[PDB]
Amino acid sequence: KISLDQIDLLSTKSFPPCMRQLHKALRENHHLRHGGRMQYGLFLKGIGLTLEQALQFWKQEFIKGKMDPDKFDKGYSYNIRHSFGKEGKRTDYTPFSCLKIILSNPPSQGDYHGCPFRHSDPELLKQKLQSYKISPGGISQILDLVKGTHYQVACQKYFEMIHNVDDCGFSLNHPNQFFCESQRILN
RNA sequence: GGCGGC
DNA sequence: GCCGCCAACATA
Numbered sequence: 673k674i675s676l677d678q679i680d681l682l683s684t685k686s687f688p689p690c691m692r693q694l695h696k697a698l699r700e701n702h703h704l705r706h707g708g709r710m711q712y713g714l715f716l717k718g719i720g721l722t723l724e725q726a727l728q729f730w731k732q733e734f735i736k737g738k739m740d741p742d743k744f745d746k747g748y749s750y751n752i753r754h755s756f757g758k759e760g761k762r763t764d765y766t767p768f769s770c771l772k773i774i775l776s777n778p779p780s781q782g783d784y785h786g787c788p789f790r791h792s793d794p795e796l797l798k799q800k801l802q803s804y805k806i807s808p809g810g811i812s813q814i815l816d817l818v819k820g821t822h823y824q825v826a827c828q829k830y831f832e833m834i835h836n837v838d839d840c841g842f843s844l845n846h847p848n849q850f851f852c853e854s855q856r857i858l859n
Numbered sequence: 860g861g862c863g864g865c
Numbered sequence: 866g867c868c869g870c871c872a873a874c875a876t877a
């Protein structure tokens with residue numbers, strides 16, 4: 673039911689901070705390192721994109737990197753298809769859970785995947801928070817949670833704020849969960 | 860990105 | 866240099 677020229681907006685309204693970052697990085701750089709391609713792609717699949725859309729969404733954005741639209745089908749295409757289970761063993765991979773994102777494959781320079789509340793240093797996170805126009809009160813309330821390593825909670829806090837609600841009404845532990853709950857209130 | 864093949 | 870095959874796991 674979801675369309676491609678709608679994502680940019682969705683990223684702002686329903687994507688959790690992690691997917692939002694990964695999306696912006698993809699539009700700015702017209703590319704993403706493996707770690708981000710994994711987390712983001714499975715997420716996009718989890719929200720609704722079909723294999724036809726996925727291949728289009730990614731090819732389109734990668735041509736702007738000015739690389740061979742052929743050098744794309746060479747490497748990147750096969751892997752996208754294997755994500756939707758259309759290659760090899762044929763496994764329709766479930767998107768990443770928060771705990772996984774938070775405790776594994778920590779990000780390094782050049783990477784944008786991972787969990788902002790966990791992998792972005794307090795000072796950079798603050799700037800992002802502000803960039804999303806989050807009230808300095810909640811920003812402060814988030815940083816606290818972050819300091820107590822309650823990353824997922826801090827993200828729930830972010831939910832409640834960007835949706836103007838008192839209680840998100842669920843415990844967060846999967847990015848696409850954040851998405852759906854958002855879609856519930858907006859759509 | 861890793862592993863694997865030439 | 867060409868290429869194949871993987872990983873995940875919430876979820877009402």
Ligand code: SF4
Pocket residue numbers: 688689690691769770771773774786787788789823824827844845846847850
């Ligand atoms: S809480 Fe889970 S989803 Fe919300 S940002 Fe941290 S990782 Fe991505």
Ligand SMILES: [Mn+2]
Pocket residue numbers: none
């Ligand atoms: Mn590569």
